Amino acid sequence: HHWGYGKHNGPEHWHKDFPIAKGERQSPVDIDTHTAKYDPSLKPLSVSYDQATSLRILNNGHAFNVEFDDSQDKAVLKGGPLDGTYRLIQFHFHWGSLDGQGSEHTVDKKKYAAELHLVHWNTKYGDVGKAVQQPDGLAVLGIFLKVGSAKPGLQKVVDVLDSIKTKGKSADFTNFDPRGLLPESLDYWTYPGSLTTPPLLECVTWIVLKEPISVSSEQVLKFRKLNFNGEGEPEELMVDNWRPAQPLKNRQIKASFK
Ligand SMILES: NS(=O)(=O)c1ccc(C(=O)NCc2ccc(F)c(F)c2F)cc1
Ligand SMILES: NS(=O)(=O)c1ccc(C(=O)NCc2ccc(F)c(F)c2F)cc1
Ligand SMILES: [Hg+2]
Ligand SMILES: [Zn+2]
């Protein structure tokens, strides 16, 4: 009775209620490193997350989101392929049932254990709702997660998951600094795309970082214990909440490095 990632309502069925699923600028895509164009005019990214205000964490079925106060320019993204200022509103992850899968975007067909999406909207449009009606309304910063050593800054997240085990649950999540989730380098690939979950609006500028961050098997293991289901319904573990790569079509993937 609604979309999901299961056999009967997963990615292959989405086109029936969301026609745009077969559009020209659908995400995610596979990043072929030998075909991306090095664009020396691309500006360096400017991540200003020093006044970031996290407020809440919630399991909305699909995944879990950490929400941010976006009433003012407190956490912004600018630079890169962007024009104007973009406010951070929320972040979430996509992960798999095994370490060899989980990411949405792939690099040379290589899948990672998980992928972080830091969602921003264009301030020019006044509100999030208006921004999703424009070709350049959103900007999502994608980061790959590979299994290795633990990431200190991710632990705060891992510890609270127990309280939002089922759909609809939320918990206060203040004073979280998102700068703990960035890799050392800000080198990236960029391309025009869409949201990777319904309604699949083609209103996003994707910025995927080259350097993945590493997380322990223990940290990823805790992601896998969440539930798609709400309290009292049959248990359905939250894993493989990822959409398979889509055809690139009339698009060019640019690289900010050589
Ligand atoms: N100012 S606040 O902290 O209370 C706030 C935080 C999150 C959201 C939210 O996630 N709504 C969905 C939503 C709708 C459209 C978009 F483009 C989004 F990025 C998005 F998160 C809305 C308000
Ligand atoms: N995986 S991803 O980064 O692409 C992604 C990011 C944000 C959202 C979201 O905020 N959903 C709510 C939502 C609800 C109705 C709309 F019209 C929206 F545009 C909208 F984003 C969905 C997918
Ligand atoms: Hg749009
Ligand atoms: Zn996402």
Can you give the CATH number for the domain in which 199 is found?
A: 3.10.200.10
Is 26 touching ligand 2 by the criterion CB < 6 Å?
no
Contact 181, 209 (CB under 8 A): no
Is 90 touching ligand 1 by the criterion CB < 6 Å?
yes
List alpha helices for the chain, DSSP H: 128-131, 155-160, 217-223
Contact 167, 144 (CB under 8 A): no
And the tokens for 230? 């709400």
Radius of gyration of the chain (CA): 17
And the tokens for 69? 């106060």
Burial zone of 155 (CB within 10 Å; 0-12 exposed, 13-18 middle, 19+ buried): middle
Q: What are φ and ψ of residue 250, in 5° steps? A: -80, 50
220 closest CA partner among 119, 93, 110: 93
User: Which structural domain range is residue 227 located in?
Assistant: 1-258
Which method was used? X-ray
Cβ neighbors of 258 (< 8 A, separation 6 or more) are 38
| Measured torsion, CA atoms of residues 242, 244, 246, 247, in degrees rounded to the nearest 10 | 160
Contact 165, 226 (CB under 8 A): yes
Nearest-angstrom CA–CA distance, 42 and 248: 21
What phi-psi label fits residue 194: left (phi over 0), alpha (psi between -120 and 50 degrees) or beta?
beta
User: Would you give the DSSP letter of residue 36?
Assistant: S
User: Would you give the DSSP letter of residue 235?
Assistant: P
The tally of domains found in the chain comes to 1
Nearest-angstrom CA–CA distance, 155 and 176: 11
**Residue 137 Cα to ligand 3 middle (Å):** 6
Question: What is the b/e burial string over 106-142, where b = at least 16 CB atoms within 10 angstroms of the residue's CB?
Answer: bbeeebbbbbbbbbbbbbebeebeebbeeebbbbbbb
Contact 189, 119 (CB under 8 A): no
Cβ neighbors of 168 (< 8 A, separation 6 or more) are 58, 59, 60, 61, 230, 231
**Residue 127 Cα to ligand 1 middle (Å):** 10
111 closest CA partner among 31, 166, 1, 225: 31
Any idea which residues carry the catalytic annotation? Answer: 62
CA distances, 54 to each of 127, 179, 213 (Å): 18, 12, 21
**Residue 92 Cα to ligand 4 middle (Å):** 6
Mutational pocket test of ligand 1: of 89, 172, 173, the residue with most ligand atoms within 8 Å of the beta carbon = 89
Cβ neighbors of 227 (< 8 A, separation 6 or more) are 59, 165, 166, 167, 235, 236, 237, 238
Nearest-angstrom CA–CA distance, 224 and 206: 26
Nearest-angstrom CA–CA distance, 223 and 155: 11
Cβ neighbors of 202 (< 8 A, separation 6 or more) are 20, 23, 24, 25, 26, 135, 192, 193, 194
Q: What are φ and ψ of residue 215, in 5° steps? A: -140, 150
Pick the atom of ligand 2 nearest to 142's CA.
Answer: 3
Question: What is the b/e burial string over 53-91, where b = at least 16 CB atoms within 10 angstroms of the residue's CB?
Answer: bbbbbbbebbbbbbbbbbeeebbbbbebbbeebbbbbbb
Q: What are φ and ψ of residue 187, in 5° steps? A: -65, 145
Measured in Å, how far apart are the chain's first and last C-alpha atoms? Answer: 47
And the tokens for 32? 């072929």
Is 140 touching ligand 2 by the criterion CB < 6 Å?
yes
